[PDB]
Subunit: 133 residues, 6 copies
C-alpha cells in the first residue's frame, strides 16, 4: 500500500495526451493523493528530480526538455503502486516498450516519453519530497 511520484511530461501536453495518460492509471484503480500543475517547472526541481542522472550525456538535454513545457506532478496511492505504475509506463526505449504500455502505445522517442514514474521506494520518497515539500 505505497505512494509513487508521476510526472506528466511536456510532450504529453504538446500532443494533447495528458488525459489519456492519467486515465490509464485511473482505469487501473490508483488514487490521486496530490497534484500540482506547473506551466514551467523550476530547473532546480528538475535537476534534483534527476540527480542520479547528473553525470550522463543526456542530462543537459533532458533538463532542457523537462522545462520546454508544462508538467504535472502527481502522487498516486495503491497496493504496490510503484511497481505497478512502472509496468504501465513501459520501457524507456521505443524498441523495447510493449504495446499495451503508455510508452509502447504512445511514445516514439527515448527522451520525449510522456511520463515519469518512481523506480523504487527510495526514489519515490525522495521524489515526493521534492515536488511536495
Amino acid at each position: 500500500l505505497q505512494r509513487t511520484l508521476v510526472l506528466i511530461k511536456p510532450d504529453a501536453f504538446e500532443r494533447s495526451l495528458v488525459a489519456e495518460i492519467m486515465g490509464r492509471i485511473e482505469k487501473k484503480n490508483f488514487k490521486i493523493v496530490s497534484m500540482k500543475f506547473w506551466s514551467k517547472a523550476p530547473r532546480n526541481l528538475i535537476e534534483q528530480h534527476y540527480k542520479e542522472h547528473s553525470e550522463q550525456s543526456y542530462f543537459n538535454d533532458l533538463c532542457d526538455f523537462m522545462v520546454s513545457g508544462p508538467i504535472i506532478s502527481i502522487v498516486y496511492e495503491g497496493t504496490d503502486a510503484i511497481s505497478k505504475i512502472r509496468r504501465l509506463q513501459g520501457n524507456t526505449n521505443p524498441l523495447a516498450s510493449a504495446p499495451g504500455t503508455i510508452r509502447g502505445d504512445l511514445a516514439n522517442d527515448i527522451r520525449e516519453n510522456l511520463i515519469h514514474a518512481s523506480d523504487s521506494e527510495d526514489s519515490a520518497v525522495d521524489e515526493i519530497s521534492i515536488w511536495f515539500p
Copy 2:
C-alpha cells in the same frame, strides 16, 4: 478568455476524471493552472456557491462538494467560458444533451460531475477563490 472548472467528488467516486478532462483537452483548451484538493475547505465551497446560499438544496450541495476530492482547473482558450459550458451540458438530467459531459455521464441534478463558470464575471470571481 479564461474559465474555472471543478472536477467534482462524484468524478473521483466513478473514476471519470480523465474522461472529463479528456473532453476539454480534445476541444483544445489549455490548462493554465490546476490544484488537487483531497477535501476542499467548506467555506471555500460556500464562497464558490455564494449565489446559491438562499436555495433549498444549498446544504446538500456544499455537503456533496466536501464529501470527496475535487480538482480546480483554470482553462484557457477562445471563448473558453461559453464553449466549455456547452460541453458541460445542462444541470438537469432531464435536459442535458447526449454528446455533453453531463448528457453522457451525469444522471442526477446534484452529482453532475463538473462545474464551469457561467460568465466572464463569475469566472474572474471563482478563479481568484481557488487561485490567489
Copy 3:
C-alpha cells in the same frame, strides 16, 4: 426511480456494437436489473413487443429482422430511466437522430437501428412483463 426495457438488436451483434451500446447506458450510470440473451427470440415475443405496430406496412419486415439474429433484453433502473434512455437512444430516423445519441453516432437505417427502449411507463411495464414473466 423507474425501470425500463431495452433490446440490443440483431444489427448490434452483426456490427459488433453490443458492448459500445450497453456501455453508453452504463456510463450514464443506469443499473442492470435483468438481462436475458436470445440467440433467436421467439416470434410471439417479438410480435407482442411490437403489438402497437401490428397494422403498419413495416410490421412483417420488422418482425423478420428482429429474429434475423440474437438480441439482448435488458431492464435498467435509474432516476427517470425511461425518458433518459430514450434521449440516449436517438430519433428513429437517420435524418433526425442527433450526433451524440446511440442512433445518431452509429445507426444509418430506419429499421436497423441497434436498440429498442420503452417509450412510456405503460409500455415499459408491459414490455418488461413480456421479456421477463
Copy 4:
C-alpha cells in the same frame, strides 16, 4: 471451442462491464448464452470454485462473488479458451500484462473483474453449472 466467463461484482461496482465484454467482442468472440445474476446463489459460486475449497482465501473469494451482481457468459470461437485466457491476464496484479483486462483494469488479486475457464474440461464443467 466454447468457454465460460464471469463478469465479477467489482465490474458492476466500477461500471466496467461494457469495457470488459467490449474487449472480447472485438477479439471477435460470439455470445452463445448469457445470464445476469443480481446475486449468485452461494453454492453455485462454491461449486464454481470447488477446486479452491482448500485454500486460505476461499472464503473471501466466495464472499466477494456474492457481494454484487455477476454475468455468466458462454463465448464461442476458435481456441476461445486459451485466447480469452490470454486477454484476461494474470491473476496477480504484480504479474498481469498491460494490454490485458486485468493488466489495464485490475489492481488486486481477488477483485480482478473477470473469470474465464482455464481448460477444456473446466469449461464443460463451469458451463453446465451456470447453464443447465
Copy 5:
C-alpha cells in the same frame, strides 16, 4: 449517394485523422476512394473553394489548406451528404454541437478539421476535382 470529405492539415497536426474517419466509419459510411496529399496543389484548393473566391478569408483559408497534408475521401451511403454534414457540425466553434466532430474537437472557424460536401451539386464538382 456519394460525398467528398477532406481531412484537413490541422487534423494531421493534432493527430485526429483516425478519430475523424472513425466517426464516419462508425455510422456505417463506406469509403469509395481515398488519396493522401502530402501537400495539395493550390489550384485544386482554389477550385474546391471557388464559390468562396470573393470572401475576406479566401486567401487565408487557402494558405491553411496547403500548410500541411490533407486526405480526400469519397464516402458513400444512404443520404451520405446531409448525414455526414450533421456528423461534421456547424462551422462556428460557438455553434457546433457537442457530439459532432467540430463540436467535440474544433475550436476555430478556419481550423475545423474536416470539409464535407453541402449538396449533390458540390458533391460532384468536388469529387471530380479530387478524383478524375
Copy 6:
C-alpha cells in the same frame, strides 16, 4: 525510415480501419502516402506476396486480399518498420499479445487485418509495388 502497411479486407468488413490507423497515428507515425483500393489487382497482390508463392496458403491468401477493399499506406518514423511490426503483433492468433492490433482484434491466421513490411528490403519492394 519508411514502411508499407496494408489495411486488409477484413478491416473494412468489421469496420476497424480507423481503429487500426488510429493505433499507428497514436504512436506518432506519419503518413507519407496512401491509396484506397476498392479491389486490388491480383498481380499487385501476388507481387506483394511473391516470397510466398510456394506455400499451401498462397492462393487463399490472394483470394482473400481481393475479396474486399484495401488501404495501402507508407508510414514514416524513426524505426517505423520494427516499431510498427511490434504494434501489429504475431501472425498466429494463438501468439499475438494483448496490446497489439492482432492480439486485440484478430482471431484468425489469414484474416489478420494488417500487413506491415518486415525489413528495409521488403519496405522498398512493397512501396514500389503500391506507389510507383
